[PDB]
Design an enzyme around this catalytic site. Sequence first.
Site, PDB file in Angstrom:
ATOM      1  N   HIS A   1       0.804  -1.216   0.000  1.00 11.77           N
ATOM      2  CA  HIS A   1       0.000   0.000   0.000  1.00 11.77           C
ATOM      3  C   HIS A   1       0.841   1.272   0.000  1.00 11.77           C
ATOM      4  CE1 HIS A   1       0.430   1.040   4.316  1.00 11.77           C
ATOM      5  NE2 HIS A   1       0.054  -0.179   4.662  1.00 11.77           N
TER       6      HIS A   1
ATOM      7  N   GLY B   1       2.915   5.819  10.463  1.00 10.26           N
ATOM      8  CA  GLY B   1       4.281   5.637  10.017  1.00 10.26           C
ATOM      9  C   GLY B   1       4.891   4.296  10.359  1.00 10.26           C
TER      10      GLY B   1
ATOM     11  N   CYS C   1       3.849   1.246   9.535  1.00  9.27           N
ATOM     12  CA  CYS C   1       3.668   0.176   8.563  1.00  9.27           C
ATOM     13  C   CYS C   1       5.012  -0.322   8.046  1.00  9.27           C
ATOM     14  CB  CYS C   1       2.792   0.667   7.422  1.00  9.27           C
ATOM     15  SG  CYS C   1       1.125   1.002   7.983  1.00  9.27           S
TER      16      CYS C   1
HETATM   17  N1  LIG Z   1       2.699   3.774   8.076  1.00  2.63           N
HETATM   18  C1  LIG Z   1       2.077   4.391   7.361  1.00  2.63           C
HETATM   19  C2  LIG Z   1       1.251   5.237   6.391  1.00  2.63           C
HETATM   20  C3  LIG Z   1       1.927   6.192   5.648  1.00  2.63           C
HETATM   21  C4  LIG Z   1       1.250   6.999   4.760  1.00  2.63           C
HETATM   22  C5  LIG Z   1      -0.107   6.865   4.597  1.00  2.63           C
HETATM   23  C6  LIG Z   1      -0.799   5.917   5.331  1.00  2.63           C
HETATM   24  C7  LIG Z   1      -0.131   5.087   6.241  1.00  2.63           C
HETATM   25  C8  LIG Z   1      -0.983   4.080   7.015  1.00  2.63           C
HETATM   26  C9  LIG Z   1      -1.996   3.336   6.315  1.00  2.63           C
HETATM   27  C10 LIG Z   1      -2.817   2.427   6.988  1.00  2.63           C
HETATM   28  C11 LIG Z   1      -3.891   1.608   6.278  1.00  2.63           C
HETATM   29  C12 LIG Z   1      -5.145   1.456   6.849  1.00  2.63           C
HETATM   30  C13 LIG Z   1      -6.117   0.705   6.211  1.00  2.63           C
HETATM   31 CL1  LIG Z   1      -7.723   0.509   6.952  1.00  2.63          CL
HETATM   32  C14 LIG Z   1      -5.834   0.101   5.002  1.00  2.63           C
HETATM   33  C15 LIG Z   1      -4.579   0.247   4.441  1.00  2.63           C
HETATM   34 CL2  LIG Z   1      -4.222  -0.527   2.879  1.00  2.63          CL
HETATM   35  C16 LIG Z   1      -3.600   0.995   5.072  1.00  2.63           C
HETATM   36  C17 LIG Z   1      -2.616   2.259   8.440  1.00  2.63           C
HETATM   37  O1  LIG Z   1      -3.417   1.375   9.141  1.00  2.63           O
HETATM   38  N2  LIG Z   1      -1.642   2.988   9.118  1.00  2.63           N
HETATM   39  C18 LIG Z   1      -1.476   2.787  10.544  1.00  2.63           C
HETATM   40  C19 LIG Z   1      -1.711   3.810  11.421  1.00  2.63           C
HETATM   41  C20 LIG Z   1      -1.552   3.626  12.753  1.00  2.63           C
HETATM   42  C21 LIG Z   1      -1.140   2.403  13.219  1.00  2.63           C
HETATM   43  N3  LIG Z   1      -0.909   1.393  12.371  1.00  2.63           N
HETATM   44  C22 LIG Z   1      -1.060   1.543  11.047  1.00  2.63           C
HETATM   45  C23 LIG Z   1      -0.808   3.922   8.426  1.00  2.63           C
END
Ligand SMILES: N#Cc1ccccc1-c1cc(-c2cc(Cl)cc(Cl)c2)c(=O)n(-c2cccnc2)c1
Lengths: 303, 303
Positions: free
Chosen positions: B41, B141, B143
């Site tokens: 993603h 951040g 991920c």
């Molecule tokens: N890093 C990062 C990042 C960087 C830029 C843009 C977005 C993210 C992101 C994207 C997702 C997300 C969520 C869903 Cl529902 C579906 C999909 Cl595909 C991705 C997410 O959950 N988090 C996240 C936040 C807090 C705790 N854990 C995970 C961060």
Amino acid sequence: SGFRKMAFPSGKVEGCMVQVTCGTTTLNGLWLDDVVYCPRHVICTSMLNPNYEDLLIRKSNHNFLVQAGNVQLRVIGHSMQNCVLKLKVDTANPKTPKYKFVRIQPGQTFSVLACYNGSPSGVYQCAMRPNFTIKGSFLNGSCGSVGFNIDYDCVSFCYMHHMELPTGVHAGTDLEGNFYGPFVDRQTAQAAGTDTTITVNVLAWLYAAVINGDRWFLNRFTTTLNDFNLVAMKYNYEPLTQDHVDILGPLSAQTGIAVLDMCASLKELLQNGMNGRTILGSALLEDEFTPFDVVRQCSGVTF
Amino acid sequence: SGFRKMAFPSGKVEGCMVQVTCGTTTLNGLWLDDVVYCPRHVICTSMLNPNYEDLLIRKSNHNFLVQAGNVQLRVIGHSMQNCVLKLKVDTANPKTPKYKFVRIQPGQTFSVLACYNGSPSGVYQCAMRPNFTIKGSFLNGSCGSVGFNIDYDCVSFCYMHHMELPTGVHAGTDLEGNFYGPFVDRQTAQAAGTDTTITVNVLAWLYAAVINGDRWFLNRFTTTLNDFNLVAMKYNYEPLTQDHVDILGPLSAQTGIAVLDMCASLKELLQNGMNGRTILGSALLEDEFTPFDVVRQCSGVTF
Ligand SMILES: N#Cc1ccccc1-c1cc(-c2cc(Cl)cc(Cl)c2)c(=O)n(-c2cccnc2)c1
Ligand SMILES: N#Cc1ccccc1-c1cc(-c2cc(Cl)cc(Cl)c2)c(=O)n(-c2cccnc2)c1
């Protein structure tokens, strides 16, 4: 979101751990630049009343076997600083991080890298108890394992493990060899004093809970610092100071809940229990997260 | 003695963490040999129904900025394996440990190295829940942060972090990009299923407690596997299998307490609560320690 008992990344410390052998005793040492630090009781043969000055005078460099992985390091000097032995070696650790030695106050937290035979086993977080013990996880051979904090890329070492006390809690020194608490590196009747709960940490964790959506313990009331401390002393909690209140400032501002407002919640929780509910996954009030720890984990600092 | 939620030493994993930037999105990648793994993603611009085949066809190597510390790595290839992006880089990671990729079963535990912008932040332990979420600690951040176990000096990676679900729990994949659970890397109404408590782990932790001197919950009774499972299903516990009983063998032998004897204790604890007492410092029954975890920490294995 979420809230876990989080330790610092241990790699910078793993690169410093060695094995120190003297006679039949083996434990861990900390190798920084050309010096290996370890508990001075490595020179004892089991101890009721050791004279470490006499015991060290009778040693030479060749009595100390230092191993960094498989590479044996050559000991070229040996001295004693308080309860720590310092073994000068002929090669500087190429993996020495930026570091310093700090002596912490009770209530502060740190990560422990538990080690056996110079090899890291596991990492966990703990706090210096008000009675200057730690509730660690330590088996035979763990002496010389260290506790630390990491800021930027600087490792602040604050604990070296020396002893398990009869109640199963742990005692040790700063990296200059000074014990935390009244303990001595000898076999005597010494025991952990009466402990207390770290009030400012409990409040920090309540703020962590709010940040993570646990709000059931909140109420409309506020208390005075003096009337809160009246309740604190009744449940064996440390007194809350204005320094503590000021330290909780940033969390109070992020959540919009005044410190003395949160104190009213804690008073209610001490008096009534939780009535079968939990906070951040716990059924007891948690006191080994500092205010710094909460901000670090709920806001995101790295190293 | 003592018993702590203990993570593996993280250094071998710290040396693998990098920053992956695509467009305005930045997250973490895992650099092993000449390949960087990260959540696919990273190529999305925010998502309701992304077609990742289309989205990746429209990218080139120059759209991917990989940084290992300050050194930028040159991406020389890019492909997609399930929900993971693999970026071939022109230099092999000199710090690649002995490793493998494993897909774990629910109930197994692992250490998480939480990371932001390619920089390690903290390390903690968690379990794969029966509903295939983890209760982690993760901010924006994070991920691409990974979960792992260490055996000998081999790192077994088992989790890469992809998403936080609406309840604040976390979802992710194995290192081949297959999600744990039914989740998909898209914005939909998906939610965590109903969870259950990991029975075999609870029993392991009760053994840990006995090893550490907590015995107040023991009793003279034994139960049958079928009658225990009758109680387990009533309190939303996973069924206990003969495989589980056999896995608890070594702990049963060290303590001399038969598994079905300990099951009688757990039944009593489920039916009556703890009556204000604690076990290994907890007021609830802990279920994120495996039998292996208990033996490792109560007997002393290193890596
Ligand atoms: N890093 C990062 C990042 C960087 C830029 C843009 C977005 C993210 C992101 C994207 C997702 C997300 C969520 C869903 Cl529902 C579906 C999909 Cl595909 C991705 C997410 O959950 N988090 C996240 C936040 C807090 C705790 N854990 C995970 C961060
Ligand atoms: N390592 C090690 C080691 C190696 C050889 C011989 C003894 C040890 C040792 C020595 C002490 C000890 C105890 C007292 Cl009361 C006073 C003094 Cl000076 C030292 C000890 O507590 N442990 C220990 C055990 C379990 C958990 N944590 C610490 C291990």
